[PDB]
């Protein structure tokens, strides 16, 4: 039985508005309703895995867990085995797999930050799971990020506390968050961010989402404009949207969005907004393509709809050679030319670089760089033709062409992180000098480059 290269994966967000379920939601789990839904033809075939978020969710774990596994038992006729379920307060993740996966999926990963202070700690944060599926890292945040159409920053700074303080995936991949530790990262939730209108439009907003012009809405989308200023989920990516507006809701229908100022509310309006969301960061130059994003329309005990998105996600199977794992192969190797790295920092530290990959036995610490001023104020540090040679664990060119080699750039002076990124080996040839490039964040914002050349030998 062969293992795959490629799986699909269902991703869901729902905020149940502290409301039991209906008593059936396959349309969530079929991605059926409005926008870019799945073919009918697809509906008896089961995803691999199934990552469930929920926000405002008044179920037990037992209660979801076994509406969850009946849905998907009634659709695919496939008992889904419980990979991992985390609660924090009413944010809740589920992550379920096809029992074939079961001896594929190790090293499986929870845990929970909770955002804000005093006032503002006490219902607000994410959950995730993370786990190795045969070669391939996978992680997966649910948030409940800060409400309220004047709080976009709150939920920007919501978003780094997460991305800072989730410690999931390799604990050995010290200087790197969660940003940068996945092949596939999967972030979704009610991040509850807004289409930034006048109230006064409120009746002009409603009468676009009747006509499916969304156009002039998603122009004012909160998280797409904060995104494209590099003020929140640098480097994600983001299918389409082509849904109306999964929030708020009259409860029992979908013909009616609630948006008026009402005690319940604080006294806030609730616009129609594309309040919950799926967005990604896969490694470069691995396969990665959203099949479906869209809302339900017949699931209506919630002021929000439900989310589904749906994705082909390239894994790489548990690879053993002669050699390696347990020893080197010494017909590999990865060579660095002509780097350097360009930071934004104003300090005067040297500076050194480490290479972590589950392609090196452990992690390597270069020589100090050469720091030089920029025409145009930077630093610059120079590694030249310094930098170590790595050595892989395997040569086979199947095997370490689909690997990554994650760098951060580090003070002599304190040994923190100023900068992260990662480098594919998929390269358009071996035994050749071809250019590289990563951007460098740190708490996932921008603080530099790194570029040069690499030479890869293969055992081919
Ligand atoms: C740089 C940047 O972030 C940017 C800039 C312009 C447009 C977009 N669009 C999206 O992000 N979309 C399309 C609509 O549905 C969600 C995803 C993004």
Same mark, same amino acid.
């Given at each position: 039985?062969?293992?795959?290269? %490629?799986?699909?994966?269902?991703?869901?967000?729902? #905020?149940?508005?502290?409301?039991?379920?209906?008593?059936?939601?396959?349309?969530?789990?079929?991605?059926?309703?409005?926008?870019?839904?799945?073919?009918?033809?697809?509906?008896?075939?089961?995803?691999?895995?199934?990552?469930?978020?929920?926000?405002?969710?008044? *179920?037990?774990?037992?209660?979801? *867990?076994?509406?969850?596994?009946?849905?998907?038992?009634?659709?695919?006729?496939?008992?889904?085995?419980?990979?991992?379920?985390? !609660?924090?307060?009413?944010?809740?993740?589920?992550?379920?797999?096809?029992?074939?996966?079961?001896?594929?999926?190790?090293?499986?990963?929870?845990?929970?930050?909770?955002?804000?202070?005093?006032?503002?700690?006490?219902?607000?944060?994410?959950?995730?799971?993370?786990? %190795?599926?045969?070669?391939?890292?996978?992680?997966?945040?649910? &948030?409940?990020?800060?409400?309220?159409?004047?709080?976009?920053?709150?939920?920007?700074?919501?978003?780094?506390?997460?991305? @800072?303080?989730?410690?999931?995936?390799?604990?050995?991949? /010290?200087?790197? #968050?969660?940003?940068? @530790?996945?092949?596939?990262?999967?972030?979704?939730?009610?991040?509850?961010?807004?289409?930034?209108?006048?109230?006064? =439009?409120?009746?002009?907003?409603?009468?676009?989402?009747?006509?499916?012009?969304?156009?002039?809405?998603?122009?004012?989308?909160?998280?797409?404009?904060? @995104?494209?200023?590099?003020?929140?989920?640098?480097?994600?990516?983001?299918?389409?949207?082509?849904?109306?507006? !999964?929030?708020?809701? =009259?409860? *029992?229908? @979908?013909?009616?969005?609630?948006?008026? $100022?009402?005690?319940?509310?604080?006294?806030?309006?609730?616009?129609?907004?594309?309040?919950?969301?799926?967005?990604?960061?896969?490694?470069?130059?691995?396969?990665? +393509?959203?099949?479906?994003?869209?809302?339900?329309?017949?699931? %209506?005990?919630?002021?929000? &709809?439900?989310?589904?998105?749906?994705?082909?996600?390239? +894994?790489?199977?548990?690879?053993?050679?002669? #050699?390696?794992?347990?020893?080197?192969?010494?017909?590999?190797?990865? =060579?660095?030319?002509?780097?350097?790295?360009?930071? $934004?920092?104003? /300090?005067?530290?040297?500076?050194?670089?480490?290479?972590?990959?589950?392609?090196?036995?452990?992690?390597?610490?270069?020589?100090?760089?050469? #720091?030089? =001023?920029?025409?145009?104020?930077?630093?610059?540090?120079?590694?030249?033709?310094?930098?170590?040679?790595?050595?892989?664990?395997? /040569?086979?060119?199947?095997?370490?062409?689909?690997?990554?080699?994650?760098?951060?750039?580090?003070?002599?002076?304190?040994?923190?992180?100023?900068?992260?990124?990662?480098?594919?080996?998929?390269?358009?040839?071996?035994?050749?000098?071809?250019?590289?490039?990563?951007?460098?964040?740190?708490?996932?914002?921008?603080?530099?480059?790194?570029?040069?050349?690499?030479?890869?030998?293969?055992?081919?």
């Amino acid at each position: 039985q062969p293992e795959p290269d %490629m799986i699909t994966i269902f991703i869901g967000t729902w #905020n149940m508005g502290n409301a039991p379920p209906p008593k059936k939601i396959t349309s969530w789990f079929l991605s059926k309703g409005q926008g870019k839904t799945r073919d009918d033809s697809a509906d008896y075939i089961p995803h691999d895995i199934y990552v469930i978020g929920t926000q405002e969710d008044p *179920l037990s774990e037992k209660e979801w *867990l076994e509406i969850l596994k009946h849905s998907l038992q009634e659709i695919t006729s496939v008992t889904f085995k419980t990979v991992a379920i985390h !609660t924090l307060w009413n944010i809740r993740i589920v992550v379920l797999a096809k029992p074939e996966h079961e001896n594929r999926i190790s090293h499986i990963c929870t845990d929970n930050v909770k955002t804000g202070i005093a006032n503002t700690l006490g219902n607000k944060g994410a959950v995730g799971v993370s786990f %190795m599926f045969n070669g391939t890292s996978l992680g997966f945040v649910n &948030s409940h990020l800060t409400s309220g159409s004047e709080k976009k920053l709150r939920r920007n700074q919501n978003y780094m506390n997460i991305l @800072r303080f989730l410690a999931l995936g390799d604990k050995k991949l /010290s200087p790197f #968050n969660i940003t940068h @530790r996945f092949t596939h990262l999967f972030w979704f939730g009610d991040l509850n961010y807004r289409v930034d209108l006048p109230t006064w =439009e409120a009746e002009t907003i409603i009468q676009k989402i009747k006509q499916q012009q969304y156009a002039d809405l998603l122009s004012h989308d909160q998280l797409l404009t904060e @995104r494209r200023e590099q003020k929140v989920f640098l480097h994600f990516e983001e299918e389409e949207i082509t849904f109306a507006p !999964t929030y708020r809701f =009259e409860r *029992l229908t @979908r013909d009616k969005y609630a948006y008026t $100022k009402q005690k319940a509310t604080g006294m806030k309006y609730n616009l129609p907004s594309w309040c919950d969301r799926v967005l990604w960061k896969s490694y470069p130059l691995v396969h990665v +393509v959203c099949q479906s994003y869209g809302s339900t329309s017949d699931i %209506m005990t919630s002021d929000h &709809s439900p989310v589904f998105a749906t994705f082909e996600a390239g +894994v790489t199977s548990q690879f053993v050679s002669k #050699n390696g794992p347990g020893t080197v192969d010494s017909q590999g190797q990865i =060579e660095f030319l002509r780097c350097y790295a360009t930071l $934004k920092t104003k /300090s005067q530290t040297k500076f050194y670089l480490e290479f972590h990959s589950s392609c090196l036995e452990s992690f390597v610490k270069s020589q100090e760089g050469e #720091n030089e =001023e920029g025409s145009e104020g930077e630093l610059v540090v120079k590694f030249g033709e310094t930098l170590p040679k790595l050595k892989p664990i395997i /040569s086979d060119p199947e095997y370490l062409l689909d690997q990554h080699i994650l760098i951060s750039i580090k003070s002599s002076d304190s040994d923190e992180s100023y900068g992260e990124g990662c480098i594919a080996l998929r390269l358009e040839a071996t035994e050749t000098q071809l250019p590289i490039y990563t951007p460098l964040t740190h708490h996932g914002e921008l603080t530099g480059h790194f570029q040069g050349e690499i030479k890869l030998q293969t055992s081919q």
